[PDB]
């Protein structure tokens, strides 16, 4: 349903949902084959050597939790598997009510059209589009919200990447920007069942495997914060004082990560700072409402001013008065803000998937495993690794790398 058609890496390009594309702001690059799996969402089965200029080399840089393999995702078979793996994960996520809500929010989360220097003109920002090569060879500029792409040099460094603006802080000013998620459905992390063990850097080999659907959901949640322009400034961190090994090393974790995980982790952000951020972003939305009201012109005859004004009215859940003037209703703002920051959390997704998972973001990496979720015999949209009939359905046996040994190959231990 979420991905209505089957995609094969070798399917011929049609210039519509299967095409060679170029990422603007990415400098000079060769067109790469991409697949549009859903409205506003694309997948590029390639290692990411375009978003960051100084990150085009896949070989292990000079001399930590990291894993390198310059050959991963270099063959057509691997790219086909990557595409099928990612599509499958989106479907697993969409199969839950929470995931359906999240993906709906992501599609509705179009980056704001605030690219004009004139306050009466509404214009798209080039950081939020890709250039799509058409059958006739010409290019077609297309707006999009999300792009799933292969990892860069460090295979296990999953993260959101987005292009910046000269002056605008798009991921924190309420505007939002297109997010490129480096991710792989072909590897997963190992964790320990015991809290005392999982949060200790010297113990555990990583007996249980993280369900990659949770990992992708985690990145999607993080991406949606950036899409709605309410990501917490990275300089806002928590000087961990709840873990003796974190304090010992003076390690710090950004509020953004704690918020994304949810559960008890989010409670580390004290009430004052919580209100501070909410007030801040409430004001940013008011700014978007004013800009819309001040808009009398629009660029790009792909839609009318009335249409786009309404698109953002929906995205930001703004209120329109009798005169057709937009404003931000505190109740509505608080509702949307809470949905994006408290309802969509890693902890809540675990409850929906019914999988075993780390209990806190404040733990220690144990290991990385190679996996293959494409075959139904190994992983299904409905149960992940814990197959219904199989003897893998209970006690999370499917995620148990010792019992379900054939589905996991430990590549590196971090403990
Ligand atoms: Ag553009
Ligand atoms: Ag565009
Ligand atoms: Ag992110
Ligand atoms: Ag991300
Ligand atoms: Zn994160």
């Amino acid at each position: 349903m979420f991905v209505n058609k089957q995609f094969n890496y070798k399917d011929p390009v049609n210039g519509v949902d299967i095409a060679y594309i170029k990422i603007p702001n990415a400098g000079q690059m060769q067109p790469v084959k991409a697949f549009k799996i859903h409205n506003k969402i694309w997948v590029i089965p390639e290692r990411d050597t375009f978003t960051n200029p100084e990150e085009g080399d896949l070989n292990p840089p000079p001399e930590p939790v990291s894993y390198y393999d310059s050959t991963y995702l270099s063959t057509d078979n691997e790219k086909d598997n990557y595409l099928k793996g990612v599509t499958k994960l989106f479907e697993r996520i969409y199969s839950t009510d929470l995931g359906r809500m999240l993906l709906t929010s992501i599609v509705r989360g179009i980056p704001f059209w605030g690219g004009s220097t004139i306050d009466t003109e509404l214009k798209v920002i080039d950081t939020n589009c890709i250039n799509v090569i058409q059958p006739d060879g010409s290019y077609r500029s297309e707006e999009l919200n999300l792009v799933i792409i292969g990892p860069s040099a460090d295979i296990i460094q999953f993260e959101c990447k987005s292009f910046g603006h000269d002056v605008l802080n798009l991921t924190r000013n309420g505007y939002g920007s297109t997010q490129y998620i480096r991710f792989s459905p072909d590897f997963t992390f190992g964790f320990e069942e015991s809290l005392e063990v999982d949060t200790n850097p010297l113990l555990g080999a990583g007996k249980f495997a993280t369900d990659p659907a949770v990992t992708l959901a985690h990145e999607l949640i993080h991406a949606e914060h950036r899409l709605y322009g309410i990501a917490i400034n990275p300089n806002r961190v928590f000087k961990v004082n709840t873990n003796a090994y974190y304090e010992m090393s003076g390690l710090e974790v950004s509020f953004e990560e704690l918020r994304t995980f949810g559960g008890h982790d989010a409670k580390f952000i004290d009430s004052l700072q919580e209100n501070e951020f909410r007030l801040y972003y409430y004001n940013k939305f008011k700014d978007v409402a004013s800009t819309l009201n001040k808009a009398k012109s629009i660029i790009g005859t792909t839609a009318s001013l009335q249409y786009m004004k309404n698109v953002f009215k929906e995205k930001y859940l703004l209120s329109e008065d009798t005169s057709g003037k937009f404003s931000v209703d505190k109740l509505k703002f608080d509702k949307l803000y809470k949905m994006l920051t408290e309802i969509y959390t890693e902890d809540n997704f675990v409850n929906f998937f019914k999988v075993i998972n780390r209990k806190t973001y404040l733990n220690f990496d144990k290991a990385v495993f190679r996996i293959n979720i494409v075959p139904d015999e190994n992983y299904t949209i409905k149960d992940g690794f814990n197959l219904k009939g199989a003897n893998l359905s209970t006690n999370f046996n499917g995620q148990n790398t010792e019992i379900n040994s054939r589905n996991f190959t430990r590549l590196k231990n971090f403990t």
Side-chain angles (χ1 to χ4, degrees):
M1 185 78 98
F2 191 73
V3 182
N4 213 310
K5 60 198 301 180
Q6 70 179 67
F7 282 113
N8 293 305
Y9 184 68
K10 293 173 182 175
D11 289 334
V13 300
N14 52 43
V16 175
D17 60 335
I18 303 175
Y20 277 93
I21 66 83
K22 296 185 63 178
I23 297 168
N25 301 187
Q28 209 68 43
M29 72 175 278
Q30 186 181 305
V32 294
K33 196 176 185 178
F35 306 73
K36 181 186 185 179
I37 67 172
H38 192 93
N39 183 45
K40 303 293 185 177
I41 301 173
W42 292 72
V43 177
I44 301 171
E46 298 278 334
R47 291 293 288 282
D48 177 18
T49 51
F50 338 90
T51 65
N52 191 174
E54 298 63 64
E55 291 192 291
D57 188 303
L58 296 186
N59 299 77
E63 287 296 304
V65 180
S66 66
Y67 178 69
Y68 296 81
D69 177 9
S70 63
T71 70
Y72 169 59
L73 212 53
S74 63
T75 59
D76 284 344
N77 181 43
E78 287 178 286
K79 292 181 185 179
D80 188 65
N81 205 66
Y82 176 101
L83 182 59
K84 290 178 165 59
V86 172
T87 290
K88 190 166 191 175
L89 292 183
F90 268 96
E91 296 286 7
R92 179 155 164 67
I93 288 171
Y94 199 65
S95 80
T96 64
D97 277 354
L98 184 60
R100 182 192 71 192
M101 300 167 67
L102 167 61
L103 292 173
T104 293
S105 291
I106 288 175
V107 174
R108 286 167 61 97
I110 297 173
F112 189 58
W113 280 35
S116 170
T117 39
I118 308 177
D119 74 60
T120 178
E121 189 176 68
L122 214 55
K123 184 178 190 179
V124 62
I125 297 176
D126 62 52
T127 67
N128 310 317
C129 310
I130 52 174
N131 287 160
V132 183
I133 299 185
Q134 309 176 297
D136 67 337
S138 70
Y139 289 71
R140 186 177 86 267
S141 181
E142 189 178 316
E143 299 180 68
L144 72 177
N145 298 352
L146 184 69
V147 175
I148 307 296
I149 191 176
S152 189
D154 188 350
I155 286 180
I156 58 180
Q157 180 60 196
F158 299 167
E159 64 198 318
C160 269
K161 278 297 190 302
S162 63
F163 296 102
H165 183 280
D166 302 47
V167 187
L168 282 10
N169 298 307
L170 304 178
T171 68
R172 302 195 299 278
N173 74 344
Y175 284 25
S177 59
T178 298
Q179 298 301 306
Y180 291 74
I181 310 186
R182 290 173 176 180
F183 170 81
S184 170
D186 303 305
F187 299 94
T188 192
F189 313 76
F191 65 96
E192 292 289 325
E193 340 69 89
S194 294
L195 190 285
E196 199 146 47
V197 178
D198 205 38
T199 60
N200 192 107
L202 307 174
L203 272 11
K207 183 172 180 171
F208 286 91
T210 298
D211 186 323
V214 172
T215 305
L216 176 58
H218 181 93
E219 294 309 313
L220 295 171
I221 294 165
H222 213 256
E224 43 112 41
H225 293 165
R226 297 162 69 80
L227 272 172
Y228 282 77
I230 64 170
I232 298 178
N233 193 313
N235 64 31
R236 286 294 186 137
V237 299
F238 174 42
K239 291 177 182 178
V240 183
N241 58 181
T242 296
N243 186 302
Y245 299 83
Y246 268 64
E247 289 186 295
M248 179 189 294
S249 305
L251 301 168
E252 303 176 306
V253 179
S254 66
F255 279 177
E256 183 54 37
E257 294 298 350
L258 300 181
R259 159 171 291 182
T260 296
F261 181 88
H264 185 258
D265 286 17
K267 301 185 189 310
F268 286 127
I269 300 169
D270 61 73
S271 290
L272 268 76
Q273 305 195 70
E274 178 101 298
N275 298 299
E276 177 190 351
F277 302 139
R278 179 160 49 222
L279 235 288
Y280 186 77
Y281 295 116
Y282 167 61
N283 292 313
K284 292 305 181 186
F285 275 41
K286 293 189 304 170
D287 290 326
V288 174
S290 70
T291 294
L292 295 172
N293 295 320
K294 288 165 55 192
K296 303 303 172 186
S297 186
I298 190 174
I299 313 302
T301 66
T302 63
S304 58
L305 180 59
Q306 171 196 183
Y307 191 83
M308 292 313 295
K309 271 188 170 185
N310 187 61
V311 172
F312 294 114
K313 170 185 175 172
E314 294 168 48
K315 173 181 179 181
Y316 300 108
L317 294 181
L318 307 175
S319 294
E320 174 171 45
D321 67 23
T322 292
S323 291
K325 212 71 177 181
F326 294 121
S327 62
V328 189
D329 179 305
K330 236 304 183 182
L331 199 67
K332 289 179 176 177
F333 172 79
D334 280 5
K335 180 180 295 178
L336 175 64
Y337 185 72
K338 189 174 98 164
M339 180 70 65
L340 300 166
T341 67
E342 301 177 67
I343 291 72
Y344 306 156
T345 66
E346 183 176 323
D347 194 53
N348 283 334
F349 269 103
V350 168
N351 289 323
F352 279 77
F353 292 135
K354 255 284 184 180
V355 294
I356 184 178
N357 193 76
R358 61 186 171 189
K359 303 296 187 180
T360 178
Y361 184 83
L362 300 172
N363 65 341
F364 288 89
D365 297 291
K366 305 302 176 182
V368 60
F369 302 87
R370 179 79 178 307
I371 60 177
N372 182 13
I373 68 176
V374 177
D376 281 359
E377 58 151 359
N378 298 343
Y379 186 102
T380 63
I381 290 172
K382 273 66 184 192
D383 306 314
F385 289 116
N386 309 313
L387 319 182
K388 296 176 189 308
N391 70 303
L392 303 177
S393 59
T394 59
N395 302 307
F396 309 110
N397 286 333
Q399 287 173 272
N400 188 311
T401 65
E402 294 185 62
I403 295 176
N404 191 14
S405 45
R406 60 282 177 49
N407 267 287
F408 307 97
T409 291
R410 186 179 288 176
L411 300 178
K412 183 175 177 180
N413 190 288
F414 300 124
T415 298

